[PDB]
Amino acid sequence: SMEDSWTSLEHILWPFTRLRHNGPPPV
Amino acid sequence: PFTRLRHNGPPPV
Amino acid sequence: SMEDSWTSLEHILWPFTRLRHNGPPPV
Amino acid sequence: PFTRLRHNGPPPV
Amino acid sequence: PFTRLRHNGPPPV
Amino acid sequence: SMEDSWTSLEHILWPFTRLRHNGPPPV
Amino acid sequence: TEAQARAIVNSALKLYSQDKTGMVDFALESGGGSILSTRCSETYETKTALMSLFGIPLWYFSQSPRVVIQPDIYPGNCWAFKGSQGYLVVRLSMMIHPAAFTLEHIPKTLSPTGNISSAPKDFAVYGLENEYQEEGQLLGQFTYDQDGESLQMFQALKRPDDTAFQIVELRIFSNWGHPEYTCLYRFRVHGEPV
Amino acid sequence: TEAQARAIVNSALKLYSQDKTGMVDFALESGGGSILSTRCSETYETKTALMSLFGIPLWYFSQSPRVVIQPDIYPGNCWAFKGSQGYLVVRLSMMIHPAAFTLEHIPKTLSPTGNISSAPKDFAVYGLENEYQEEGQLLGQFTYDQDGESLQMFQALKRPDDTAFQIVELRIFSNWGHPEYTCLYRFRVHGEPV
Amino acid sequence: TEAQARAIVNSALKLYSQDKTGMVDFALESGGGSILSTRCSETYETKTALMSLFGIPLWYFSQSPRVVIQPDIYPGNCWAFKGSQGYLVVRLSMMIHPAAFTLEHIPKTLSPTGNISSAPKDFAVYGLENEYQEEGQLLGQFTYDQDGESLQMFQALKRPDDTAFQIVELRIFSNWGHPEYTCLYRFRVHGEPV
Amino acid sequence: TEAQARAIVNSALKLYSQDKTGMVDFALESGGGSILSTRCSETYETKTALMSLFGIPLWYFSQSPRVVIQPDIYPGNCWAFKGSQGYLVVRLSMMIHPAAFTLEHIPKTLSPTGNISSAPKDFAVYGLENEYQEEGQLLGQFTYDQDGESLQMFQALKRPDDTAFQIVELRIFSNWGHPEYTCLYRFRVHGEPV
Amino acid sequence: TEAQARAIVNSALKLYSQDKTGMVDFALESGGGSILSTRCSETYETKTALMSLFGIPLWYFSQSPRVVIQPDIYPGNCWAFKGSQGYLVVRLSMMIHPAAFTLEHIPKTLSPTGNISSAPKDFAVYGLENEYQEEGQLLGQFTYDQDGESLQMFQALKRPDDTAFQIVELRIFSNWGHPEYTCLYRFRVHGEPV
Amino acid sequence: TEAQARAIVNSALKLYSQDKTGMVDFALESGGGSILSTRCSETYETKTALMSLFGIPLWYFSQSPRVVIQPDIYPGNCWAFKGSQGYLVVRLSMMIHPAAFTLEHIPKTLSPTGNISSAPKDFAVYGLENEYQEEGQLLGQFTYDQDGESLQMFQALKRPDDTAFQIVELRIFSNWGHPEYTCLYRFRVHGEPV
Amino acid sequence: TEAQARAIVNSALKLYSQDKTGMVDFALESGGGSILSTRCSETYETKTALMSLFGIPLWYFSQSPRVVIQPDIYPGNCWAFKGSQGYLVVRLSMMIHPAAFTLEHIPKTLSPTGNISSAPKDFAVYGLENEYQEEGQLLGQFTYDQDGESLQMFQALKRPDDTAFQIVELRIFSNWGHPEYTCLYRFRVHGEPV
Amino acid sequence: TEAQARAIVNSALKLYSQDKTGMVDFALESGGGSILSTRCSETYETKTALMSLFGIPLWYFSQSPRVVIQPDIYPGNCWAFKGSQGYLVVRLSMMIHPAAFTLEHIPKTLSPTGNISSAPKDFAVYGLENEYQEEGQLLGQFTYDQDGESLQMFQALKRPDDTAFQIVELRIFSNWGHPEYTCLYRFRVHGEPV
Amino acid sequence: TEAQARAIVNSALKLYSQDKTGMVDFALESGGGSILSTRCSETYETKTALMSLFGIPLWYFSQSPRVVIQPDIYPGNCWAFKGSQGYLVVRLSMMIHPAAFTLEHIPKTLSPTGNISSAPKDFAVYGLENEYQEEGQLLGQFTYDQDGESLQMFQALKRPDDTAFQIVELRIFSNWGHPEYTCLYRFRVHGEPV
Ligand SMILES: [Cl-]
Ligand SMILES: [Cl-]
Ligand SMILES: [Cl-]
Ligand SMILES: [K+]
Ligand SMILES: [K+]
Ligand SMILES: [K+]
Ligand SMILES: [K+]
Ligand SMILES: [K+]
Ligand SMILES: [K+]
Ligand SMILES: [K+]
Ligand SMILES: [K+]
Ligand SMILES: [K+]
């Protein structure tokens, strides 16, 4: 439930935030 | 009270 | 408190929802 | 915290 | 879940 | 946390509310 | 004739309290009626209804076709659709042989403009066997009379084979002259269950 | 003659406009009455009233015991509880000596099904001194008559000691035959304030 | 006589069904009237609050001024302002020459306390050309009669120059003795559109 | 032959990369198409709900009709409506003369149950001049072939008068045997802009 | 004269730190003053104030009459009312015999336009015995001088019968030429408590 | 002469602009100080500051202990705690050897009541090594002088062992006679960082 | 020749379009699979992916185990768990006899670092009968080959008793040398429904 | 030549599945690339993207420059900047010697208007040593060919001193004739890490 | 001399009260200035966050760039950006020819650490004709003097052609040695309106 609510909020927020990588992400 | 409910029933496919 | 909060939300939602009876309501 | 409070005092009439 | 977090670290000055 | 959340809400609400003193405030 | 007079008054009040008709309204929403909104014409957006929460005004909305099957008929408590032509589809609470229909509009004496030009004028009622059917059985052609009473009843056509219906379509072909919208206050369907 | 008739009609209309009884309803919610929900029987929850938003199913609407102390009695504006016997606890707006009670149900002529088998039949009213008390003082045993008028009044028992109450429990011991649920449209409490 | 009696009863019921007056209420909210809340006296503060948020109690009020222009007048569905003096500002549904006003209060027979001491007693009605003008034009000084009928109508002063208004101010100078608040159930404005 | 084989492979990959068709999809949402949800049949009600708020379960649905005009067709990314009949209304990215339509469903080889009984079977496509017009112009009657390919294209009827449409209705008259719902994975509209 | 010079500097700084006057401001909101907003003229909606939450901008609002009784007077921290005429009603923290009033406006050297044309010019101050009184006692007629200092003090009229007031009305009859609004930065009331 | 006077004035203004002391305030909230609210005395909560929205009473505004570490000291911008003795716990922005403390209160000349009877009178300052410790090391016993300057500084006790602290407790043992509450405008902590 | 080549290309493209395998994935989330998050190894949480709004740092984005059952496998669309050994628990959309499993990782040619040292190396798959069971039935031990193809399939052990499962646990016993974390791009489960 | 043909098909599909290039894209966001949004030209606000929550539409937004480094290139999945000139600054996932760049635009066959006039035409690519540097090293001048393939690759200038870069600037000097905006679907940077 | 000294003190206080400069600040937010946050360098990331929502910490920041154009400069009321280089973009209240700029920082005597190493050191000011233009026109290069006064003014370069600007960029090239961040307390723009 916690992760599902967070992912709903993340979907709402995603296209309006800016993403900066300060270091390489896991790949 | 805020809750996310679990879906054991499969989604429509 | 639970029912009162729900009824507040229901009052907010009522004129914008669509109501379909799939079977007869209690009468 | 979200709460509805009980009103034992009668409303204005 | 809603929470305010405590800041022991001083703010920028 | 409680007071901090309340003060955030108070900052949001402050310029739009009207304040009436029914008696002298602490001074 | 005092006792007879009191009896007449009691009968009149009883009938009045019984939804003014003493007849089941099979379209009434609280009793089981429903609006097939996907089969309604376009709503005219008036934004004349205010929403409030805890005494705080929030925003102005227009009125849903649902109000057509709700009993409050104070001025403004009507569904306004765009233009002078429209349609409404209602699923009834029971499978019935339809006997009559009722249309209500506010009296001219309660209209702010002095006229009821937004009232429906020419309309027809059809019975539908399923919600997906396009061509229905004509149950009647009528005119709501602007010089008549607020509540008007209309008798359905008698068919030798009385097929029952649980879905009715109201088509309004014309209103009483308002060029912007037509406002429908309440529509009732009366008949006998199978 | 004519003046007497107008006087009779005006008196009847005045009484009708005074909540049909001319008596204070100490259970009426807008006046201060409230339902102790935790002390009510289980609500009949069906999934047949689907509320949807933009075609998305949203929730299944049932009716709260609150409607029992609200004046609207169009068909469906009633609290349906599970089974054929149940109970409701009401906190009155004032501490009163209870004198009478009123039960309203829709007339058969407005019921889509032709019957009011869901109406309460055998019931009793008890007074409670605190919300946590299980056994109250019996204020009366009554039967709601399906062949009687829509609104029915019942006189409370005369006790040598007039004890006041602000909480009453309505126990419905039977309904008029509906196998699934029982529907309460409105319950009123009349008496004298302390 | 029987036909005459039936005619009298029908006439009485017709007038009753037409908002009891047969006259447009230009203040009715659903019909286009609105409360200019920013220009109204402050709502009565109820001892207890409705919500609590982050430990702070919120909403110490019962009814919004909007209820004053809504037809439901069951006990408690009224706007309470502090004390025995106050004011309410209404924007009418149309620009009219005001002819009469209506005040409604619950009858003593429906008041839980046995009295209507919270009912308005001395009041006046003013027309405003803008909602922010300080002094309005007196349309009349009146008293609501505590021993009178629930609904009371009051005739506006005749003015030589037919000036129209779409904003009216209701000033309550006194109530019928309640020391904490005054409750307004309904206020109506009648007149002729321009 | 090697150069010819490389050319065939490159051509196949190019067509595959061009949305598998090399043709504009005027229904594609990202390209300007939109679902007129108010005019769509009701979304399938899933046994369980997604949220709970104040003890009331909310959101009894899986997928919004929007997915029908989105290219992802992994199993489950489809719109399910109740039963074996339904309709969907799409506003196109441009006013076009419709030439063809495309329906996609998952192959039997990717279906967990081994069958695609929930796939649409009998359907028709109509052009609408306004979204609220009752009867649209038939652009074609088709069957989706359960033993055919996952993606199927259907040629529109040739009309003597070149009338353009920007609103299309997809009507599903039958599915391939699933008794509870029908799932639409993707619907595309191809044609010539005006 | 070094010690005397330091004493002069200390006295000047002390007076400056004591709200520049060394006198109680009975209108100051934090000290107990209040705006009777229902008795203020219309706010000019500039929407030049940004609201933010956690560094996120949310929306632009205009300024409440409350700012007139708040000490911050940086450019823009003023209440703008529509036109060149308006009024403000303040409830004082104490019942006082009014001695003087203070009006502040930004100096021309800090105004972006080079002028203070939005500053109040001609105004008058009245004492009111209760918040519902229309006609007050004239406490003085004044002009705020655009060529004067930023802070200007005005002496109240001495009346032989010094009736005390806890409510004052500021009426601005004219501004310094701005055609759209007038901006009021701060108004103070000084006097002696009873 | 003239140059000496300008130098003296500039030095005075510079010191005034440096928070009137020219010394770091390790309790200042914006710089990193915080109030341990659970370790503060009870706040004086009156219902005399009513915040309302659209005329609807919303909440009763009291002041948080946070204001004690905020620089605004206009009358009313103070924390009022219940009774005439109390305590406040402040976590400093840095671990310091405390050297001095500062208490500010409004001058009598700006107090509406003519007195500062609500000002702290007898107080002591203690250092705490952890937030859960009850008994701290006495850093000093002092009296705030009602006939002294608005801002008063107090030198901490010289101890042979300079122990550092980041938590200080201010105990007010008495006020200047107000029977209901005690008002703290600002408290500062000065010392040397480790 | 030419026709044979076109047939081969079409078959290859068809298989590619069928999730590259032509086999049902009972772990795929959109089809009904879900991650039992409480039974997953710790997620590698770095602070290197900063999401900000209007330049305000908002939160540090990590990837959920959910991505492991989502088809996107562009570099970075993988779940990174802490260390070089870990576990994941997946609830399948159906109760199946598991036949095979699939692991996908990005090719070295698309990895920015030139290596896939973060890829899983040594792993095993177990079936669980309930979500609370610690020890499952071993369905197979495998190694993901860093020099093999991007997509690799592994055949489950043949057991004389075909027991069905709806929960599988993937245990990664080693990765290909990355010292900080292990990255899973996609895991699929294939088998036969009951 | 059947085995050779199948090998050719397999190689083509493998390359296609490896992001169509088989080469690392050091600008790809999921792999570590980032947009320095503060160094991008103005976004054209089209508001053609719909946001939804639980199937409820909420509002229309425009597309962030971030989409330029995201692989979805269905029509509309592009960043539109105002006019025919603009710039974009990307921080790469690694410090590389840049070898080539890739620009993608939709084919004309998938554009609703029949043309790709909004596609970039004349552009140049620069390497930057730090995010604050204004003047970069020219890495190449190019034209995207509207009559060419959807994906186009461009070879960087070879410099004898190959200074590595982790920041690149794309400057678009012209588009293919659209007067309102230019839409950039995807930009990739390829090279060798240091 | 006494009158001369009083005049000097009054002049100093007047200048001090006029924002310490007696000059319009066209960047002041309350006066019409605004921060173009989309064009500002990223705010400093504080180790800890402010909120937590669904277990995710949110808001890792102290102050919004807005504080740079607000007059409060108590320690901590400053905007911190990461590192020793950054930029800020301000839209002025009017289109002006810029004449001077002002930078404020806390004095060393009020800094908790004893130093102002976080103060800006080397900076430049540019005028922009649009907020999205890459290279602005240099209005001046300056150094903030760590051994100088708290408030420092800097004269703009004299340009032969009087071009106006309403957007200015402040670039900080270096700070006074703090290795993590740089804090800006206030930046002002002075000039002549067009
Ligand atoms: Cl419900
Ligand atoms: Cl508070
Ligand atoms: Cl995350
Ligand atoms: K109605
Ligand atoms: K009821
Ligand atoms: K009312
Ligand atoms: K789809
Ligand atoms: K002010
Ligand atoms: K303070
Ligand atoms: K994945
Ligand atoms: K893209
Ligand atoms: K500042």
Numbering used by the authors:
A (entry chain D), C (entry chain D), F (entry chain D): 529 to 555
B (entry chain E), D (entry chain E), E (entry chain E): 543 to 555
G (entry chain A), H (entry chain B), I (entry chain C), J (entry chain C), K (entry chain A), L (entry chain B), ...: 618 to 811
What does the paper say about this structure?
It is formed of nuclear SUN (Sad1 and UNC84 homology) and cytoplasmic KASH (Klarsicht, ANC-1, and Syne homology) proteins, which interact within the nuclear lumen.
KASH6 peptides are clearly bound at both of these KASH-binding pockets of each SUN1 trimer (these are herein referred to as KASH6α and KASH6β). In other crystal structures, at resolutions of 2.0 Å and 2.3 Å, we observed no third peptide, with the KASH-binding pocket containing only water molecules. Hence, the third binding pocket on the lower surface of the trimer-of-trimers structure cannot stably bind to a KASH6 peptide. We conclude that the SUN1-KASH6 structure is a 9:6 complex in which three SUN1 trimers are bound to six KASH6 peptides. Importantly, the distinct KASH6α and KASH6β conformations result in an asymmetrical structure in which the N-termini of all six KASH6 peptides emanate towards the top surface of the molecule. Hence, uniquely amongst SUN-KASH crystal structures, the SUN1-KASH6 structure is theoretically compatible with outer nuclear membrane insertion.
